[PDB]
Amino acid sequence: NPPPPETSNPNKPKRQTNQLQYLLRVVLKTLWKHQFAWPFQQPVDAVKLNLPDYYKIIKTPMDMGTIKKRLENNYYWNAQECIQDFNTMFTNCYIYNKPGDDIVLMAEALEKLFLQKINELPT
Ligand SMILES: COc1ccc2c3c1Oc1ccc(OCc4ccccn4)cc1C=C3N(C)C2=O
């Protein structure tokens, strides 16, 4: 396994916005409870999961556990930066797998819910 993505970075400027607070309190914490959230709650453990090719294919890994800790640490400058991490997590799943795979069906459902929730953000 590679090191998991950073959740803090002292030379990166931090910020807290109403939209970033909403991304943690509403968007992430609601998605987290979905029946299909479990594969996305932690970095992929390629040793545990017997996926020795995972990080040969996926070069920008991302997961909701990382995103959660980034939000908690005020790691992001703005909501768009956090949204990009969700999108990277979903696209990684489509890249590493195949259409119709169980894990892909899960990501597709979570992505739809994610889009529903970010359609309207606080001002
Ligand atoms: C062949 O299996 C796959 C195949 C592809 C993918 C994955 C697979 O498997 C997982 C198994 C477990 C797991 O986590 C187990 C767990 C997590 C939380 C609570 C309880 N149990 C996460 C994943 C995440 C995956 N992602 C992102 C994939 O693209």
CSV table of C-alpha atoms and ligand atoms in Angstrom, one decimal:
chain,number,residue,atom,x,y,z
A,1,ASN,CA,0.0,0.0,0.0
A,2,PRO,CA,1.1,3.6,-0.6
A,3,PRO,CA,0.7,6.1,2.2
A,4,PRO,CA,-2.8,7.4,2.5
A,5,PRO,CA,-3.5,10.9,1.2
A,6,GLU,CA,-2.6,13.7,3.5
A,7,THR,CA,-5.3,15.1,5.8
A,8,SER,CA,-3.2,18.1,6.9
A,9,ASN,CA,-0.5,20.2,5.3
A,10,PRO,CA,1.1,23.0,7.3
A,11,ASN,CA,2.1,25.1,4.3
A,12,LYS,CA,-1.3,24.8,2.7
A,13,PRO,CA,-3.7,27.7,3.7
A,14,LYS,CA,-6.8,26.6,5.6
A,15,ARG,CA,-10.3,28.0,5.4
A,16,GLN,CA,-13.8,27.5,6.8
A,17,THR,CA,-16.9,28.5,4.8
A,18,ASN,CA,-20.6,27.9,5.2
A,19,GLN,CA,-20.4,25.6,2.2
A,20,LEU,CA,-17.6,23.6,3.7
A,21,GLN,CA,-19.4,23.3,7.0
A,22,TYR,CA,-22.5,22.0,5.1
A,23,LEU,CA,-20.3,19.6,3.1
A,24,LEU,CA,-19.3,17.9,6.4
A,25,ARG,CA,-22.5,18.2,8.5
A,26,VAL,CA,-25.0,17.4,5.7
A,27,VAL,CA,-23.3,16.0,2.6
A,28,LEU,CA,-20.6,13.7,4.0
A,29,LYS,CA,-22.4,12.7,7.2
A,30,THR,CA,-25.6,11.7,5.3
A,31,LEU,CA,-23.8,9.8,2.5
A,32,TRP,CA,-21.8,8.0,5.2
A,33,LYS,CA,-25.0,6.3,6.5
A,34,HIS,CA,-26.1,5.0,3.1
A,35,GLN,CA,-26.2,1.2,2.6
A,36,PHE,CA,-23.6,1.5,-0.2
A,37,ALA,CA,-21.2,3.8,1.7
A,38,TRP,CA,-19.0,1.1,3.3
A,39,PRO,CA,-16.5,0.6,0.4
A,40,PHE,CA,-15.8,4.3,0.3
A,41,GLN,CA,-15.3,5.0,4.1
A,42,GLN,CA,-11.5,4.3,4.1
A,43,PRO,CA,-8.6,4.2,1.7
A,44,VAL,CA,-8.4,1.0,-0.3
A,45,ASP,CA,-6.3,-1.5,1.5
A,46,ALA,CA,-4.8,-3.4,-1.5
A,47,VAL,CA,-3.2,-6.0,0.8
A,48,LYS,CA,-6.3,-6.7,2.8
A,49,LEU,CA,-8.6,-6.7,-0.3
A,50,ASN,CA,-6.2,-8.8,-2.5
A,51,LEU,CA,-6.1,-6.0,-5.1
A,52,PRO,CA,-2.4,-5.9,-5.8
A,53,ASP,CA,-3.1,-3.9,-9.0
A,54,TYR,CA,-5.2,-1.2,-7.4
A,55,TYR,CA,-2.5,1.3,-7.0
A,56,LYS,CA,-0.9,0.3,-10.3
A,57,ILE,CA,-4.1,1.7,-11.9
A,58,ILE,CA,-5.3,4.4,-9.4
A,59,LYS,CA,-2.7,7.2,-9.0
A,60,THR,CA,-4.9,9.7,-7.2
A,61,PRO,CA,-6.7,7.6,-4.6
A,62,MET,CA,-9.5,9.3,-2.5
A,63,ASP,CA,-12.1,8.1,-0.1
A,64,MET,CA,-14.7,9.5,2.3
A,65,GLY,CA,-12.6,8.8,5.4
A,66,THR,CA,-9.9,11.1,4.0
A,67,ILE,CA,-12.5,13.7,2.9
A,68,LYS,CA,-14.0,13.6,6.4
A,69,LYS,CA,-10.7,14.2,8.1
A,70,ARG,CA,-9.8,17.0,5.7
A,71,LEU,CA,-13.1,18.7,6.4
A,72,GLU,CA,-12.6,18.3,10.2
A,73,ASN,CA,-9.1,19.7,9.9
A,74,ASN,CA,-10.3,22.7,7.7
A,75,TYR,CA,-7.8,21.4,5.1
A,76,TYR,CA,-9.7,22.8,2.1
A,77,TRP,CA,-9.8,26.4,0.8
A,78,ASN,CA,-13.3,26.1,-0.6
A,79,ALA,CA,-16.2,23.8,-1.3
A,80,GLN,CA,-15.1,23.2,-4.9
A,81,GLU,CA,-11.9,21.7,-3.7
A,82,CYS,CA,-13.8,19.3,-1.5
A,83,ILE,CA,-16.3,18.5,-4.3
A,84,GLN,CA,-13.3,17.6,-6.5
A,85,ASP,CA,-12.2,15.0,-4.0
A,86,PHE,CA,-15.7,13.3,-4.0
A,87,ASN,CA,-15.5,13.3,-7.8
A,88,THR,CA,-12.1,11.8,-7.8
A,89,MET,CA,-13.3,9.0,-5.5
A,90,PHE,CA,-16.3,8.2,-7.8
A,91,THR,CA,-14.2,8.3,-11.0
A,92,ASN,CA,-11.5,6.1,-9.4
A,93,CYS,CA,-14.2,3.5,-8.9
A,94,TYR,CA,-15.4,3.6,-12.5
A,95,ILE,CA,-11.7,3.5,-13.7
A,96,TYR,CA,-10.6,0.6,-11.6
A,97,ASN,CA,-13.7,-1.6,-12.2
A,98,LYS,CA,-16.2,-2.3,-15.0
A,99,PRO,CA,-19.7,-1.1,-15.9
A,100,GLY,CA,-22.3,-3.2,-14.0
A,101,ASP,CA,-19.9,-4.4,-11.3
A,102,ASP,CA,-21.5,-4.4,-7.8
A,103,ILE,CA,-19.0,-1.8,-6.5
A,104,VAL,CA,-19.8,0.4,-9.6
A,105,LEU,CA,-23.6,0.2,-8.9
A,106,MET,CA,-22.8,1.3,-5.4
A,107,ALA,CA,-20.7,4.3,-6.5
A,108,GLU,CA,-23.4,5.3,-9.1
A,109,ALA,CA,-26.1,5.4,-6.4
A,110,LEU,CA,-23.9,7.4,-4.0
A,111,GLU,CA,-22.9,9.8,-6.8
A,112,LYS,CA,-26.5,10.5,-7.6
A,113,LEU,CA,-27.2,11.2,-3.9
A,114,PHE,CA,-24.1,13.4,-3.7
A,115,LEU,CA,-25.2,15.4,-6.7
A,116,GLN,CA,-28.7,15.8,-5.2
A,117,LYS,CA,-27.2,17.2,-2.0
A,118,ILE,CA,-24.7,19.6,-3.6
A,119,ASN,CA,-27.2,20.9,-6.1
A,120,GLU,CA,-28.0,23.7,-3.6
A,121,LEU,CA,-25.5,24.9,-1.1
A,122,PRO,CA,-25.8,27.6,1.6
A,123,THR,CA,-24.7,31.1,0.6
B,1,LIG,C1,-13.1,-6.9,-4.8
B,1,LIG,O1,-13.6,-6.0,-3.9
B,1,LIG,C2,-13.5,-4.6,-4.3
B,1,LIG,C3,-13.4,-4.3,-5.7
B,1,LIG,C4,-13.3,-2.9,-6.1
B,1,LIG,C5,-13.3,-1.9,-5.1
B,1,LIG,C6,-13.5,-2.3,-3.8
B,1,LIG,C7,-13.6,-3.7,-3.3
B,1,LIG,O2,-13.7,-4.0,-2.0
B,1,LIG,C8,-13.8,-3.4,-1.1
B,1,LIG,C9,-13.9,-4.0,0.2
B,1,LIG,C10,-14.0,-3.6,1.2
B,1,LIG,C11,-13.9,-2.6,1.5
B,1,LIG,O3,-14.0,-2.3,2.8
B,1,LIG,C12,-14.5,-3.3,3.7
B,1,LIG,C13,-15.3,-2.6,4.9
B,1,LIG,C14,-15.3,-1.2,5.0
B,1,LIG,C15,-16.0,-0.7,6.1
B,1,LIG,C16,-16.8,-1.5,6.9
B,1,LIG,C17,-16.8,-2.8,6.7
B,1,LIG,N1,-16.1,-3.4,5.7
B,1,LIG,C18,-13.8,-1.6,0.8
B,1,LIG,C19,-13.7,-1.9,-0.8
B,1,LIG,C20,-13.6,-0.8,-1.6
B,1,LIG,C21,-13.5,-0.8,-3.1
B,1,LIG,N2,-13.4,0.0,-4.0
B,1,LIG,C22,-13.4,1.4,-3.7
B,1,LIG,C23,-13.3,-0.4,-5.2
B,1,LIG,O4,-13.2,0.3,-6.2
